[PDB]
Amino acid sequence: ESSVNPVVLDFEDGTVMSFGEAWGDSLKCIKKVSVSQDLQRPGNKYALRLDVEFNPNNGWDQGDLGTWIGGVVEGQFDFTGYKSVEFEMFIPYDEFSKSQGGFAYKVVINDGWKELGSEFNITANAGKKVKINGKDYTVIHKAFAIPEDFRTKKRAQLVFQFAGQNSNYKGPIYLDNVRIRPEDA
């Protein structure tokens, strides 16, 4: 089987789907990675919970979270015919709204540290606000292109970098619906 089937890391098997440190001691601001039912709702039972603690004196309080597309560590994945990577992030709105500063993220195919996209200065007023299980969440949703030069066999590590920007936020950030897609961005 050589396909261009969508690769959908939605945590719906109730595992972390190979998410963890991108390299030794890389998690840093991310104090725990777990599979969580906190956002359990019709059609969507599990998400990846990242317990973070940012320091408000640190302008770039980074941590790096990786997964292996295919689960095989130091495996290659053939990105031929894949054109975008999509994801959603959820941050509890009331707690995040009380925090100072903001946070940034990068989405990277880590074969030569190739950034697909990034955003900075995320606060509770970014994206959209959605109520889940009694609680409002700030929701970030983006699709970034896989550039044509990377649509080939590459080291199969997808990395999410998170960085506190003079933030004092201490709480979960949830990741869900990470898709490596044949569709364009």
Strand partners, 140: 89
Q: Which of 10, 21, 51, 136 binds Ca ion (CB under 5 A)?
A: 10
Q: Check whether 93 is labelled as a binding-site residue.
A: no
**Considering the rule CB under 5 A, would residue 88 count as an interface residue with Ca ion?**
no
Nearer to Ca ion by C-beta: 8 or 126? 8
Which residue(s) pair with 40 in the sheet? none
> What is the x/- site pattern for Ca ion, positions 25-64, by CB under 5 A?
-------------------x-x------------------
In sequence order, what are the beta bridge partners of 161? 64, 106
Site string for Ca ion, 150-179 (x = CB under 5 A): --------------------------x---
51 appears as a binding residue in the annotation? no
By the 8 A CB rule, do 67 and 18 touch? yes
Among residues 181, 176, 182, which one has the least CA distance to residue 17? Answer: 176
* CA distance readout (Å), 101 to 88, 90, 141: 21, 17, 20
Provide the minimum distance between the beta carbon of 47 and Ca ion in the complex, in angstroms, as a whole number: 5
Gap between the Cα atoms of 99 and 177, Å rounded: 26
Task: Catalog residues that contact Ca ion under the rule CB under 5 A.
Answer: 10-11, 44, 46, 176
